[PDB]
C-alpha cells in the first residue's frame, strides 16, 4: 500500500535558489566536452565518446541520438538521465506531430516539449529533475537551420554557437575569436574538430570522436532513390575514417 | 482498385493503380494507394479510402518510433503484427485490405491481410476489385528464377488486367521495386495508360448571359 | 464472428503411436469462394514440443493462438515446460470466454517423453477432453468409422504417416472447402519433422 | 428527416494560375422548405479558406474546432497555418470524428504564400484525403457537379476567366435543384486581394 | 527534502551515495564472472560455492534463461537477481508476441536501465543493485556482449568481467587481445573457447576449479543452453595434457 | 516513513507567511527587469535581456515576450521554464472563451485563472509554487487598455504603470514623477526608454539588453496591432528618441 | 529514539518486535477484567462491567454477532466496534454462502489478515483491543483469544483484562473439574462467578456490575444482564 | 544510526537495510521447525511450546496447507506467518484455475518470492518475520525449498530455522550424509523426533508437544497428512531410548 507521496523534492531555499538544480549544474561540469556551431548553413555537433572499462567500446556507444530524422541531440551530464529523457522525447514528437500532422515537427516546437517534460519533473515530487542540458540541433523548412539549448531547469535560449562540458566558458570563448560572421559548414567542421582537440588530451582518434552535421539530405539518406514522399533525414554522421582525414588537415 | 505484390529471387515489386471514383466519374486520376511505412517497407492498400490510409499512418508512426528506439532496422513482422492487433481490437471495424511487403536483412517477404482479420504468406498475392483478374496472371507467369526485369514486366501486366476487366479501375500505374541489394525505387506514374471521362469541348461564355447581383472586394489579413 | 467468411481446410487430426504423436492437417484458406491462400500453416507452434491443429474460422483461431503463444512463452520461462493439458487449458479459457464472438476448434497435440503423446480436443464452446486420438474439423465425421478401426495403440513411424495420409486424403476428396498441400508435424524423440505432400502424391497414395 | 440534406448545400472549388476560387450557396432549409437566403458555409482563418457543406450544426462545431486548433498553433509558432499543413490537421480531426456521427464534406482552399502554388484539396464523410488540383466538388449535387466541371472546366485560367467558369458551372447545376437555390456567393481568391461577387439565381 | 539519507537525490559532489554503495555490495554471493565471445558462440564461465551439504548445487544458478536464445548472468544478491529475472522474462515474452521478434541483448538492457534510473528518482522505491550481463548469439549482428550496471548505464563490450578480481581478469583479456589485435577469439568450435576461458580464470583467481565450482553456459545459434557437471569435468581434464 | 520524509513547508508560518512563497518573491528580483506603461493609445512593454553573449542570437525577441492571444501579450520576469507551463495553460484559457461566446477574452478574468492556479499549489498537492511574475498587456472594448500584473503569492492588481524585477523601487520612483494624465504611444516610447537607461545594473544602455513591443491601433488591420520590435529595430529607436549613447 | 519506533508502524526493532505492539498489548490489560471458560460443549463468558459513575449507567460490551456467536472486549471501546462490525459481516456471509455457523479458527485467521494489513501502511494502526470469541457449531463450543497483533490461540479457559492471572491460576486448578462438568448451563455459570472473584483485589462484586453470556449445546446466544445475574451470585 | 533503520526506500552499504536485519531476528525468537528431504518424500516437523495446561492439541498447529499436497511450516512471528500462507493460497488458487494443473514446488516458491521481495523495495509495506520451509511432491519429483525474509531461496536436502537451527542443522547434515538422504519417509519420522528432542535443550524451561507431518509419494500417496496416532507416540518413545537428556 504505497503511492501516496507527492511532496516536492525541489524546494525553495533562503536565497530563493533550487537545491536540485544547483546540484545538477555540477553534473554537467563533470561531463565531457560537447559543442555546437551554427554556420547558418548548417549545424555541427561534436562530442567525445568515452567509456568506463578498457574492455568496453565507445565505437559501439552513442551520445548523439536522432530525436526525429532531421534533428539530432547531444548532452553533457549523466548517461542514465539522458537515455530516459531521449525515449520520452522521441515518443511525444511522433504522437503529437505526425498523427495530428504529417510534417516532421519544427525544431523550436520540439524544444518546448523537451523543456516542459524536464520542468514537470522538477515541480512534482517522486521524480527529480533530469541532470542534463542538451543542445538540440535541427533543420525545418520554414525556420531554416536552427540551434537551441535546454538548461537543466527546463529553461531555453537560442544560440548561434555555444559549448558545454569541462572548461565550458573557455571553449565557448575560443569559438568567438576563431569564428565570426558567416563562414561555411565545411570550414566550421574544420574549426569544430580543433576546438574539440584542445579540450581533450590522451584520446585523439576518430573511434572516440563523433561529429555529425545537419546540412544535407540526399536520396542516399532517404533509403530510396525514388520520387520523394517524405523529407527524410538531414542528419548525417561523418565516418570514423572521415573524421580522421580532417584531423590531419589541421 | 488493383493492388499486387510479386516476389523475385532478388527483391519484391508491389504496384497499384491510382484511380478514385465517385460513380463512373473520375474524382482523382491520382491518389496514392502505395503508402510508405519506412524507406523499404512499403504497403499497398485497397477498399475504403479513409480507413487504409489512417491505419497505415498509425502503424507507420509506431514502427519509426521502434526503429529509433532499438538503434536497428525495423522488421516487416513488427508492422504485420501491429496491423493484426489493431484489426482484432476493433473486430473488423477497420476495413483495410492490405498487402504488406518489405525487405530486411532476413530476406524479401510477401504477405497479405484481409479486413476479416486473416493473414496469409504467398509467393505472389493480390487484393482489390481487380484481385481475380490479377491473381490469375500472377500465378501463371510466376516461375522460379524470377528477376527484376521479369518481375516489373509481370507487375505491369497484372494491374493492366484489372484495369481492363474492372472498369472501376483505370488511370496511372505506380510501381515500387524493393531490392535487398540496392536502394529502393518508387516509380511514380511508370505507365500513363488511360484517361479522364468524356468531354465534348467547352468554350467561352458571353457576358450578356452572366450577371452579378452586386459585388464588393475584401482583404485577407493576419495580425 | 469477427467479420465475414474465413475458412480453412476443416480436417485435422492428431494420432498417437509407438514413438509419439503425429498431427496432420490440410492447408488452404478461402474467403467466400476466392482462394485466399493455396498453402498456409494450420500446424501452428505454440511451444517447441506442443503444437496445435487449427479449425473453425481462420481469423478467430489466429488471434486466439497468438495469445496462447504469449502465455506459454511466459509459463515456460517462469514455471517450466508445460503439458499438452496445460496448453489445452489456455485454449479453453479463450474459447469459453469468447464463445459469444469467436469460434475456435482446437486440437492441442503434444509429445512428452514421460507420459508419451497426448491428444486433447477443444470444442467451439471451450472444453478440455482427453482421447487416444481425435478427429475434428467437419470432414472428420466421414472418416470416423475409418479412424476408429485402423487406429491401434503401437504402430511404426512410416505406417502412422500412411494412416494420416490415407485419412485426410479421403476427407479432402469428399469435402469442398479443403485442398492444397497436406502438412504433417511429427513430434518424436528424433526431433520435429515437418512433412509436406503435394497434391499429386496424397491423391495417389 | 434527412442526415445532411435538411438544409442542403453544395460547394465548388477550382484551380487557376496564382488564384483559386471557392463558391457556395446561401440556402438554409428545414426539409424541402427554404427558410433563409443567408447562411455562410465557407469560413477562413487568414489565407486558408475552409468550406464545409452538409448539416449546419456539424459545420459549425467543426469550424470552431479548426479555429481553436489554428489559433493556438499560430500563437505558438508565431505565424499562420499553411494550406498544406491544414489539410493534415483536417484528416486527423475528421478520422477522430468518423467514430462520432458527423455528416460533413469539407474542402480546403488557399494559396501558399511562401512556396507560391495554388492549392486546393478535398475531404469527405469518411474524411479521406484527396490530392488533385483541377476542381474538387462536394455537397448534395456532387454527382451533377463533377459532370459539369469535367466538361466545362479547362486547365489554367486567369481570375476573370476562372469567375466565368465557376459561376456558370454552379448556376446551371443549381438550377436542377431546389436544395441549392436561396441565393449564392462566389469568392475569387488571390493571396493579396479577394473579390466577392454575389450571383442572382432561382429559388422555389 | 532536507533528506538524502532517507530518500535518493543528486549530490553536490555529484556522486550519488545510493548508486556508489550499489556498485560496492553485489559480491555477497561469493561470485566472479566473465563472458567472452567466440567467432560463432558466446560462452559464460561462472563460479559456484556451496556453503552447506544440506544444499543441492543443481538448483544454484546465476544464469537465467530469458527466452530460448537470450541468456542473462546476474551478479548480485540472489533475491534482487531473481526479481530482475522475473521482470525481464515477461518483458521479453511480451516483446516477442507483439513485434514477432526475439528480444535483442541491448534492448532488454536499455529497458531495465531506464526503469532503474526511474526507481533512483523515486523517493518511495529503491533501485536494484543488480549488474546484468546480457548475451546471445544474434544472427542480425553475430555474437554480442552487453552489460548494464544498476545506475542506468550500459555499454558494449568485447568481453567483460565482474567481481572484485575484475582487474586481474581484465589484464588477462587485454594481453590476449593486444596480441591478436582482435576483439573476439576466432577458434572454430565452442569447445576450444570454453577451455581457453577456463585457463584465464584459473590464472586470475589463481586456483584450480572443480565440476561443482564452475557452471558454464554457452549461447549458440538460435539456442541457449547451460552445460552440465559431467561435461564441465571434460574441460578441466583436457588442459592438463598440453604440458 | 512517508510523512518522515515530509517537512511540511507548504503551510502558514509562526509569522503567518508561506516559506516557499516569500522565496519566490526573491527569485523575481534576481531575474531581469520588466516595465509596463499603459497609455490610452497603446501599451508599451519592455523586458530586459540579461547575460547577453555575442553568440547569443539577436534574431529572437519572443523569449520573454509571449502572445497569449492575438490582443493579449505578456512580458515575463522570472524563468523561461516556470513561465512556459503557465503560458501554455493561458493560451488554452483564451481558446475557451473564444469558442463558447465567439468573442475575445476579458483580461481581468484570464489573469484570475492563473493566480488561482498558483494559489492552488501551495495549499494542496505538496507542491512548489511557480516563481514567475507576468505583466499582462491587453485590450477590451469594455475598458479600453488594461494592464495587470500577477506575482508568486496568487495576488493580482491593476496598474496603469508598473515595474517588476531588479531595482523595482528606483524605476517606480522615476515613473511617478514623469507620469502625466495626457498620453500618446510615441510619447510613451520615449518615457519607457528614458527610464530603462537609468535602472540598468550595467553602464549606459544598449538595445540588446532590451526586448520591446508596442500595441498601436492598427497597422495591417482595423485596430489592435501588436508589433514586437526585433533587436535591430530597437537599435534604430534608441537613436530616434535621442538616447544615442 | 523512542519516538522512532512509536511514530512508525512499518518498522521493527532489535528485540524481534516493534514498540507499538508492546503498547497495544498493555492496552488489553487496561480493559476491565473478563474470564472465559468452556468444557467444550458449552462456553461461558463472565465479565465484570464497570461504569464511570453513579450517574452513568452500563452500556454493552458483550455483543451478539449472531444467534450462535458473540464476543466480549477488553481494551479500547472505539476499536472494539470496528472489529465487531467485521466479525458480524463475516458471520453473515458464512451463513449465506456456506450454511455455516462459522468456526473460531476460520474467523480468527481472517481477523488476523486485516490487522496485519493496517501495519502495512501509515495512518492505519493495530486495534489495541482483544476479544474472546465464542460460538457453538458442530465441533461444539469454542473459546478463542484474539489479540490485535494477530495471535490466535484457542484456550479451554483464559482471561484478558487487568489481573488476568488471578482467574487463570484458579482456572488451571479447577480445570479437570470443569471439563468433566459437561452438559450443564447452571454449573458452569456458577464457576464463572467463582473465577472472576480471584481476579478481584481492588473492585467490588455486585449484581449490576456483573454480566453473564452463554452459548452451548441447547442454548443459542443469550445474555444475562443487570438483574438477571443475582441468582448465580 | 544511519537513517536506514526506518526506510526501505534507499540503498544501504551492508547490501541490505537494517529493518530487514530486524525481521531476521524475529525468526530466531520463534520456536523450531525443520524439513527432511527423503528419497520418496518430504517430512516436516515442529516444536509447539506448552506453558499452560489450557492448550488443546493440534488446532494451534503452525503447520498449514496450501492445496492438498503442499506443506508449509514456519518459525518466528505468528501474524506474519498466517498472512504469508494466506497470499500463497490466493496465488496458488489462481494458478490452479488458469493452467488447470496443481502447482509445481519451484513455481510456488517464485509466487511467494516476488511478494516477499516486493515489501523490501517498499518502505510502506512491512517485511516478514518468518522463515518458511515448504515443499511436497509434484510431477517433477519431490522438492524441499526454504524461504527467508530476504526473498532468498534455494533447493535443500535438509533445512532448518528457529532457535535450535544451528544444533539441528549439525545433526541433520551428519545423518543426511551418513545415509543417502535420510533413507525413506518412515525412518525419517523417528530421526525427526530425535532432532525436536535435542533442540528442546535450547528451550528447556517450558515443555513441548511434538507435531510431525508428511507428504510422501510412497507412504501417503501424493497427499499431505499430519503424522499422528500410534506412529507419533512410537517416535517419542524411540527418542527417549537413545537420548535420555
Structure, described:
Chain B: GO terms for molecular function: endopeptidase activity; threonine-type endopeptidase activity. Chain B: Its EC number is 3.4.25.1. Chain B: Keywords: Cytoplasm, Hydrolase, Nucleus, Protease, Proteasome, Threonine protease, Zymogen. This is part of a larger assembly, with eight protein chains of eight kinds. Chain D contains four helices and eleven strands; from the N terminus they run E-E-E-E-E-E-H-H-E-E-E-H-H-E-E. By secondary structure, chain D is α+β, with helices and mostly antiparallel strands. A five-stranded antiparallel beta sheet of chain D has the order 9-1-2-10-11, covered by helices on one side. Chain D has a four-stranded antiparallel beta sheet with strand order 5-6-7-8, covered by helices on one side. In chain D, strand 5 and strand 6 form a beta hairpin. Chain D is globular and about 50 Å long. In chain F, a hairpin with a 4-residue loop joins strand 3 and strand 4. With 245 residues, chain F is of the alpha+beta class. Chain F has one domain: Glutamine Phosphoribosylpyrophosphate, subunit 1, domain 1, CATH 3.60.20.10. By secondary structure, chain G is an alpha+beta fold. Chain G has one domain: Aminohydrolase, N-terminal nucleophile (Ntn) domain (Glutamine Phosphoribosylpyrophosphate, subunit 1, domain 1, 4-Layer Sandwich), CATH 3.60.20.10. Chain G is built from five helices and nine strands. In chain G, the strands form two sheets. In chain G, strands 7-1-2-8-9 form a five-stranded antiparallel beta sheet, covered by helices on one side. In chain G, a hairpin with a 2-residue loop joins strand 8 and strand 9. In chain G, helix 4 packs antiparallel against helix 5. The longest helix of chain G has 22 residues. Chain H has six helices and ten strands; from the N terminus they run αββββααββββααββα. At the B-D interface, strand 4, helix 1 and strand 13 of B face helix 3, helix 4 and strand 11 of D.
